[PDB]
Amino acid sequence: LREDLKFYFMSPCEKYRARRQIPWKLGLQILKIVMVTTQLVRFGLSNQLVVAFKEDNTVAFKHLFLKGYSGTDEDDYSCSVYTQEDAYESIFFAINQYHQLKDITLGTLGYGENEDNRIGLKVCKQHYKKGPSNETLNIDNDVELDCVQLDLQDLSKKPPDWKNSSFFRLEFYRLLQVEISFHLKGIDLQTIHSRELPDCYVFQNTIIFDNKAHSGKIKIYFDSDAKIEECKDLNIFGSTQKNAQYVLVFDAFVIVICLASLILCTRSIVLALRLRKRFLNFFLDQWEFINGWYVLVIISDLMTIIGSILKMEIKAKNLTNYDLCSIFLGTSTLLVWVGVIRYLGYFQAYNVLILTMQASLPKVLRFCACAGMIYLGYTFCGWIVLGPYHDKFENLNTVAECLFSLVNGDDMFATFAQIQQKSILVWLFSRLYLYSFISLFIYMILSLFIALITDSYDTIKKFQQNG
Amino acid sequence: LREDLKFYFMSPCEKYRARRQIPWKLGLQILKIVMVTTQLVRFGLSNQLVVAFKEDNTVAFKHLFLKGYSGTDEDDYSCSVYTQEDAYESIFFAINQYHQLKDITLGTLGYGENEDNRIGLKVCKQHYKKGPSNETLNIDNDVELDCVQLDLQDLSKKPPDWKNSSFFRLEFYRLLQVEISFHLKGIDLQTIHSRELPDCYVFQNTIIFDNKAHSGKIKIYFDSDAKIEECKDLNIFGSTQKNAQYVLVFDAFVIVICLASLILCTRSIVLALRLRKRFLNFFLDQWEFINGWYVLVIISDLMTIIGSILKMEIKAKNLTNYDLCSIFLGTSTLLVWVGVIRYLGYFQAYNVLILTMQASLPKVLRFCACAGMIYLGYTFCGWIVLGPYHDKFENLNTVAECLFSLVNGDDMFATFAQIQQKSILVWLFSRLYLYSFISLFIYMILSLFIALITDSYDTIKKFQQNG
Amino acid sequence: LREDLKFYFMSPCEKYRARRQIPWKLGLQILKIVMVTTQLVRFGLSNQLVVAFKEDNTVAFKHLFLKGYSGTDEDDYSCSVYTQEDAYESIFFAINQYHQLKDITLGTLGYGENEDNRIGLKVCKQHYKKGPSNETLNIDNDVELDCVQLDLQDLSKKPPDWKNSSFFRLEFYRLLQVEISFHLKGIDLQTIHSRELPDCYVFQNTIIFDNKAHSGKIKIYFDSDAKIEECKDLNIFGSTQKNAQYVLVFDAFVIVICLASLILCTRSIVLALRLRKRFLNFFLDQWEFINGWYVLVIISDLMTIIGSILKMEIKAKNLTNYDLCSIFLGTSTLLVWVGVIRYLGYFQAYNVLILTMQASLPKVLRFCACAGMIYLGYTFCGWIVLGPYHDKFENLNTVAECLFSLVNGDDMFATFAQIQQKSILVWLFSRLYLYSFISLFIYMILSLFIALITDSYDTIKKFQQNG
Amino acid sequence: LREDLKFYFMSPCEKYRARRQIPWKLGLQILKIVMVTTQLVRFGLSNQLVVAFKEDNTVAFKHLFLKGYSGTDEDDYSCSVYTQEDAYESIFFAINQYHQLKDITLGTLGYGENEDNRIGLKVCKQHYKKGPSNETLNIDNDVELDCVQLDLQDLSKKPPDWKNSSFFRLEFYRLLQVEISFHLKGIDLQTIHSRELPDCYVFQNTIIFDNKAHSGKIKIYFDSDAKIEECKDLNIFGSTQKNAQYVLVFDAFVIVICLASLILCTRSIVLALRLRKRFLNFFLDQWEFINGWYVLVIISDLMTIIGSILKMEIKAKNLTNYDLCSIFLGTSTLLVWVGVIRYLGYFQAYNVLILTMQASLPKVLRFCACAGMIYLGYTFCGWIVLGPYHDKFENLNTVAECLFSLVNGDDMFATFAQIQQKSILVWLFSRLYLYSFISLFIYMILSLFIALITDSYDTIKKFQQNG
Ligand SMILES: COc1ccccc1N1CCN([C@@H]2CCCC[C@H]2NS(=O)(=O)c2ccccc2)CC1
Numbered sequence A, B, C, D: 001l002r003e004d005l006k007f008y009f010m011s012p013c014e015k016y017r018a019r020r021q022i023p024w025k026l027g028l029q030i031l032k033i034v035m036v037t038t039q040l041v042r043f044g045l046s047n048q049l050v051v052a053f054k055e056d057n058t059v060a061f062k063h064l065f066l067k068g069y070s071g072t073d074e075d076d077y078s079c080s081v082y083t084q085e086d087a088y089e090s091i092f093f094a095i096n097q098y099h100q101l102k103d104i105t106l107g108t109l110g111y112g113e114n115e116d117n118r119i120g121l122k123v124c125k126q127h128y129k130k131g132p133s134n135e136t137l138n139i140d141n142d143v144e145l146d147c148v149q150l151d152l153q154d155l156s157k158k159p160p161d162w163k164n165s166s167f168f169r170l171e172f173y174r175l176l177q178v179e180i181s182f183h184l185k186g187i188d189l190q191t192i193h194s195r196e197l198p199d200c201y202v203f204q205n206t207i208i209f210d211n212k213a214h215s216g217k218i219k220i221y222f223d224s225d226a227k228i229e230e231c232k233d234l235n236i237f238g239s240t241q242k243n244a245q246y247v248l249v250f251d252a253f254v255i256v257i258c259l260a261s262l263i264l265c266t267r268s269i270v271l272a273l274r275l276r277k278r279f280l281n282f283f284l285d286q287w288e289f290i291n292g293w294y295v296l297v298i299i300s301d302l303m304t305i306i307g308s309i310l311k312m313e314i315k316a317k318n319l320t321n322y323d324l325c326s327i328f329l330g331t332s333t334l335l336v337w338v339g340v341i342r343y344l345g346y347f348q349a350y351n352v353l354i355l356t357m358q359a360s361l362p363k364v365l366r367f368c369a370c371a372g373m374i375y376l377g378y379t380f381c382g383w384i385v386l387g388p389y390h391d392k393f394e395n396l397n398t399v400a401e402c403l404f405s406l407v408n409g410d411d412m413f414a415t416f417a418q419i420q421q422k423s424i425l426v427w428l429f430s431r432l433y434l435y436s437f438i439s440l441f442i443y444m445i446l447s448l449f450i451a452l453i454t455d456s457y458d459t460i461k462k463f464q465q466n467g
């Protein structure tokens, strides 16, 4: 039935005068765009404050408890020691700084009760089970774990006997690690200006003096786990914070709107399929009656719904970890803004470029299929050869990202210079390898990617012009 | 009337022999180019000296008054302290260095009178209004502000009692900030070689010990506000500086020339419109009789006039802030040099490229319209996800600039490496995100931008060749 | 004979139904891909541990024995001294740190016997043969070498007389170098968790205090040579490591499979040549009956075989140097993964891109022939001129890599800024040189490389479409 | 006369069989290439050693005489001081280190006689002519210069009175600079292994304590001027160095060969012009009978001749400055290697690319003419606006190089991030400016440069194919 199929394939701008139907579903989609974007913005702006407070407190803790800390971490660990005396100095510094906390800290910070309800410091050792050294070792396979609890009144003793205790004989040739752990209370007092009750915090802090490698270096890790707990005893005049109602009602509105959009899009797909079957049955156009933009909308609505549920759960349980909810909401927003291109396609000057991209994607991917085998071979060869001599080739994922950046011309000279001429064979191989890869990929593969795009544009343009 | 319309559409090189009219307006435009460029050059060369003197004095002040200053700022603040004793040491160092200024400074520098006409040092505290700590805080919402004035004869007292005063109990758990402020006189003695009277300066200096965050770190800000004031009592033999007459007369000349150019361009536009109406009335060419280069000239003349007025005002009032005047004059100069292309268009070999750019701009912008939605979605998603884990994604504008640089291949490997694998989910998402964005934008969008430019060139060239 | 030639030129997917022959050789090639890749992965993963242990021990040694070592090397040497007293302090620090090793080290480390079977420290001097200074030098051409052996019981003497010995008069104006050498035993105790017997190590350590240049700086080199030796006396309960059988049997399997693949590929080439001669003799197609992918397979199989033999030799002799074997195996793997493209060529959509690359390569190389002469001239000129004033132009290979990176837009602004304006002539020449090179190569040569690729794509595509 | 003109226009490969003439001039050109390249290589390799020795001695001097020198210069000066006491400490450190030189230096170094034939240290002061401070200055325009000579026996006095002398009252508010100057003898003893007599050196060293700016910072400059002088009294057994004969005879050979090549090329040009006039007179081809490669050869020969003369002069007068000779020889070598393309043009597959480049250059330059005006406007605007707030825009040449690097995508994100948001107006303007410039130049101008190159290639290829 032509009188209906043409109306279906039309645009909303024309339907308003072919049948004078108002485009309320387009208004629903615009409202969804606005509400999703504003929800994401509010969520990010609220997360920034909590993340900043936790990270700043962690930096202050590193400066307070780590001896000689320079303010920047050494890779995944804060600092390291190489001498038998440096380790003792760092451990005793951490303990002594814990003892004097009230006199040194600039924050609104204090001691917290541990799991045993004691206020104090726990330090643990892990040594091999038996222990002459280096020549006739008796070291057994399994480990012995020893811990001691030091309370504030123990550290206070005029002569801190604990420092002379038998516990601190570290026999570093058997040592696996030493762990220092304690709890601290905190308050995010900066929030007081809102007249809301300020958020308290509890920090679970651990210092790990790690020499699993037994290579003569101890790596020092500082970790802090922060929980909100409860502002249970404070006399700060003002008001409490029950804005959850407001935030929970906006999330409910977002969920409802996304649900409505999903229902309407699925209904549109069902109607299009009924039209397709009617066309198939009517008489002996293309099979693709399904509008592909509807699928993207359905995916985005599902992700937005589940991310909003996750956000409501996190707020209700007063959690402070946002990774999965952030991923869901951000991907939903990304797909929501991509879907705006559907409304630009209703105009001729914009449609040809969209059709050019649609024609471009498959052949570019089929050429990526060929390029990927050369890429894999080069990744394996660079990892196996240059890895022991180059920081950018240490492991396979770093190799892949280095090569991907190198195809785009990034950091090329540093990549060339970063490998020493200590081994002449490896240096010559590195020169051959880098020259071949960079030349082939930049000057041939990327040039064929430009040629394919240009040919797709020419094809689409000549189709649109000639008809 | 063809005998006039053709003459109007012609070029000045041909009018000199079709009607032997001399091209005095082109000479006026060339003179305007020369005078605007030389005014901008003189202005910048004069600004460099004042800016350099102020900034060098600020660096010397930071070295003089900030304890342990390394010579480079920590982001927007000069330095920071994390310990209760470091803050006291920094504050007392600032005060003591102020006391000893005459014995430490290498410059031609001295004490200045404050608003109260006293010579001395003012330091202020800002604490919460009530103050047990951390467990039962009585902290009220509003702040109490306390200040003390320390004169030179007070700091001189053999035993500097001020250091033992009750004022310096900082109760850091209530502390918002401590501010130290003072005035210094200075002389730009380097100018003496000109036999002009040297420019004196007054520096208003403030040191802010800031812990609004209450995160256990105090940020230390140093700020200096410099005013010229007057060289009211000096015996340096030589001559005074009244070159203002010279500078004010050149600015008047520039204003007059730009006014004449604006009047002539508006007259040309009026005459072109009269020609257009005469053509419309004559008989049953294109509607665009208005030369678009005239609009750019009018805009540039308006900006030059207002910027010259601003410059004259700044010099007359002896100010030292140049932002708005610099913007106006620089944009005027930029548009003036762009307008030289109009004179290259009078030659065939150059005209085709100008026409190619004119044909290129609209379709490139209409493709930018489609690309911008993908760009916005990626910006929001990267901000929400990678922001807590990546310095380049902390806030939305940084995200946008990072993505824009990334499309152009800049700093790609560092962008890949800058995000820790502490959270595996976020790391995998970052890899997917970066690969998708870089691949799509570099290998498809930029390739369609090259294809559009090439097609525009082919169209213009075949039009010019075939006729 | 057409009935056979067509079958020969066919694809394996079609032969399974034209003659129902199973493609067992393709299965052999897939098995070879899998086994080669897994062998390379296991080899790299095993090498990482040994390399990491050796390098970490070297870093710990540098921190232990080098005075004031900052944790990062100064180019090819660890550190340097410029003062007559700094050198003495560094030498005596190295000796004293050797004396106290058991009390300072964090690792499972101990003293090793030297070649003379003594446990101790050897230090050697190299001075000119004769020695007034600077005005009337009597310095002869040849050198005098003097060494002393210091045992542990000598260093222990309450008053370390050795420090006052006549040996340590270094007369630095005649000094070539001072060398300190010693042996250390070590254990890779981290491996104990496998219940395998841990790998012991012997480190041969040398410290070179080098002033061959006589330019007033002594360069300090630290080198460590590690050998496995034998875990001959240890009481660590567990099991020994005879997994060699497993690793040796997988290498034997890889060798056998590569040998079979090589034999089959050579047989296929022989059969193709017989077909070619039969075609030549039959009647008065192209001469290239040889499938070029077979040659790559043969090369890869030869490299894999020899690399596996090298790996087996290294493991049997318990060596720890992997450069040549890594090169052979990695290049073999790279060529193996490149050869997968042969299987993509059996599909039309992929074949056209392969043919485009094949058509592109020769003309791109013939244009590289012209570009290389300009490249060589610029390399020589930049080396001769900018070398004394620019770190990126010091020597010819650095010049070539800098120019290659510069063509790809890398580090351009730093390259411009890195040359001082101390000599105005050289600065102007550097500006002219850099602008000319960058402009010519980026905006003309790379543009002709894009044009050649596009023309090759157009030719291949129109051939495939039109037939 | 066709029988001669065709032979003239031919190639040497064909002349060997059309007339069997041997191509001895091509052999002369090949010999010239070889000899010029080897002369340049020997020259650079010999210069490297002298430059390295001088620079290493300068670094050792900076470490010896500059207090607290970190091993890296602060821009154009080695180090700086901001305090009245730091300057005194640095000056007295320099003098005391000079006094103790024999006990601290690691090199073959000693004291040199000054112009007055004394061995000692000269230090000079420059103050304003009159000198209350800051309030009523009596400072006159002109300067007073005061110097004192300190000999070794003066510095030796048990109590170094000189340190208490009235000379060292620096009245820093009048101070322009303090200069310390001395001479040192040196020997390049590393050359002794050649059995040649070693090269002695004399270093003229000056330390400038500079505060011309009077901004509260003193900049400390160290400069060293090295001359060879004569190895007039040394007992080092071996042989002298008279290899000059060898080097002077190779330079004479190069001069002779370049002269012969120049004469032959000019003769060829004269013969071509006679052919052109004969063609013009014969009958009523193109006017360009002159082979353009001959002009390049003549220029290269002239530059090689004059550079060889300069090199011979420098060696004869025993100078150590090579800038102008290096420029001449390097440019000669660059043009010599570019001229090899003439021999590639004798082959069809290479000729089309050369013709493509020749056709490309003019239209690319005519588009550069249009692009340069936009470039100039942006340079002026960025200098005037962003200069006070951005290190990359401080002065016009830095602006131009920054923009040129920015067009090529280098350092884009750092350029965006390097400007503070202290002034919001300037920050917004910087964003607008950077986005507009980068977008316009990368996505439009560079795309038209690619289109012009492709169109030139298509034109040349279709001309060569169709005929
Ligand atoms: C969105 O995706 C694309 C859109 C358009 C064009 C290409 C792509 N791709 C890009 C690369 N990308 C892979 C990402 C993971 C690393 C390996 C890449 N594969 S690669 O062919 O070897 C390759 C490598 C460097 C440059 C170009 C191609 C695949 C997607």
Ligand SMILES: COc1ccccc1N1CCN([C@@H]2CCCC[C@H]2NS(=O)(=O)c2ccccc2)CC1
Residues within 6 Å of the ligand: B364, B367, B368, B369, B371, B372, B373, B375, B400, B404, B407, D435, D436, D439, D440, D443, D444
């Ligand atoms: C002068 O302007 C242009 C002249 C010619 C071509 C393009 C542009 N444009 C460039 C980008 N520019 C926007 C600037 C602000 C950030 C977002 C940009 N938009 S974008 O399409 O997403 C995009 C992003 C990366 C690369 C290419 C396009 C718009 C102008």
Ligand SMILES: COc1ccccc1N1CCN([C@@H]2CCCC[C@H]2NS(=O)(=O)c2ccccc2)CC1
Residues within 6 Å of the ligand: A435, A436, A439, A440, A443, A444, C364, C367, C368, C369, C371, C372, C373, C375, C400, C404, C407
């Ligand atoms: C695999 O190889 C290539 C595949 C496809 C296209 C080009 C190449 N080549 C690239 C360069 N490469 C040489 C490597 C050693 C330095 C000199 C290079 N030669 S260059 O022409 O002067 C040149 C220089 C810069 C940019 C482009 C061309 C040769 C191979």
Ligand SMILES: COc1ccccc1N1CCN([C@@H]2CCCC[C@H]2NS(=O)(=O)c2ccccc2)CC1
Residues within 6 Å of the ligand: C435, C436, C439, C440, C443, C444, D364, D367, D368, D369, D371, D372, D373, D375, D400, D404, D407
């Ligand atoms: C050898 O030269 C060229 C060979 C082929 C193509 C272009 C050039 N040119 C490049 C630029 N170059 C000028 C160098 C000095 C700075 C200004 C440049 N001019 S620019 O048009 O504004 C411009 C700016 C950026 C990118 C492209 C063009 C001129 C030569």
